[PDB]
Amino acid sequence: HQLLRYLL
Amino acid sequence: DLKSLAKRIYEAYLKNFNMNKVKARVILSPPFVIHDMETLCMAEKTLVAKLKEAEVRIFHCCQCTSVETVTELTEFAKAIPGFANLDLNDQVTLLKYGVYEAIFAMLSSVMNKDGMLVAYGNGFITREFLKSLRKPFCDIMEPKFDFAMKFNALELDDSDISLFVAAIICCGDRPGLLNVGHIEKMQEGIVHVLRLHLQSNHPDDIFLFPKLLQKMADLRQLVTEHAQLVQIIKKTESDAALHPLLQEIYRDMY
Ligand SMILES: CO[C@@H](Cc1ccc(OCCc2nc(-c3ccccc3)oc2C)c2ccsc12)C(=O)O
């Protein structure tokens, strides 16, 4: 979850 | 402690979501109406410029709305007291399993029995146009109105909703949570402040609290059914890609 981790 | 929790969640909500219930209700009762294919194409020239069969284009525009909402929900979540202190893998897990529940709870605010707002309230798409879509695209639309008409009869306001969406995110039984204890304690704090808020905001709706608890499990089912249609669409429509953010969220769901 690269992009979710990216947001967080 | 938490005599300040409700204020912080409410402020985070108004600060992070471009659309809210007051704005939505005011706009609903002027927006460009999409009611047929020719108005769809107009709206696509006028409203959706930056964002090819029709249903697929509509599917695409819906998912752009989810990507942006997920972006707002992440920022809202970081402002919930306690959340930023969780392990980053837990933060990911909570947003992953919670965003769509939150999305459909909030989408309810821009929907009425006849259709819903689009493009930041600059448009309105009718329920009948959505029903005229070919399957499976039509099928992701109507169950949301079914849910929204009933959730909207509860007449929540933005402050109730902010607490409700916070409760949905900080949810202690999501799969694979590294630290259930800390998350369950965030949850109890929020659900406690919610309970008290509904009591003082809606003094004559004795069962609103339990009713909302029920709306939580209903949204769960709602997302499971939605995720299943999106998986069908993904495997059987060669022209419908899922945005990579949405694809991570949906991976492993069942
Ligand atoms: C593909 O579904 C999305 C979730 C979703 C996200 C957003 C949604 O509604 C957004 C409102 C909306 N806007 C449009 C639209 C159409 C053409 C041009 C511009 C806009 O259609 C709708 C229903 C809906 C409605 C039913 S499901 C859903 C997802 O899975 O990410």
Q: Which residues in chain B precede a discontinuity of more than 2.5 Å between C and N? A: 29, 51
DSSP at B241: P
Question: DSSP letter string over B122-139?
Answer: TEEEEHHHHHTSPTTTHH
- Of B104, B222, B223, nearest to B165 (Cα)? B104
- Of B225, B252, B242, nearest to B66 (Cα)? B242
* Alpha-carbon torsion angle B82, B86, B89, B95, nearest 10: -10
Q: Determine which of A4, A5, A6 to mutate to test the interface with B (most B C-beta atoms within 10 Å).
A: A4
B24/B125 Cα distance (integer angstroms): 14
B162/B218 Cα distance (integer angstroms): 18
DSSP at B83: G
- DSSP strand pairing (B115-118 vs B111-112): antiparallel
Q: Is B88 helix (H, G, I), strand (E, B) or coil?
A: helix
- Of B214, B177, B154, nearest to B96 (Cα)? B177
State how far residue A7 is from chain B, nearest Cα, in angstroms: 7
B41/B35 Cα distance (integer angstroms): 11
B98/B219 Cα distance (integer angstroms): 10
List the domain boundaries for chain B: 1-254
Question: DSSP letter string over B2-60?
Answer: -SSHHHHHHHHHHHH-S--HHHHHHHH--PEEE-SHHHHHHHHHHTSTT---HHHHHHH
Numbered residues of chain B with Cβ closer than 8 Å to any chain A Cβ: 70-71, 74, 77-78, 88, 91-92, 95-96, 244-245, 248-249
Q: What Å resolution does this PDB entry report?
A: 2.2
- Assign domain B1-254 to its CATH architecture: Orthogonal Bundle (1.10)
Q: Determine which of B76, B100, B245 to mutate to test the interface with A (most A C-beta atoms within 10 Å).
A: B245
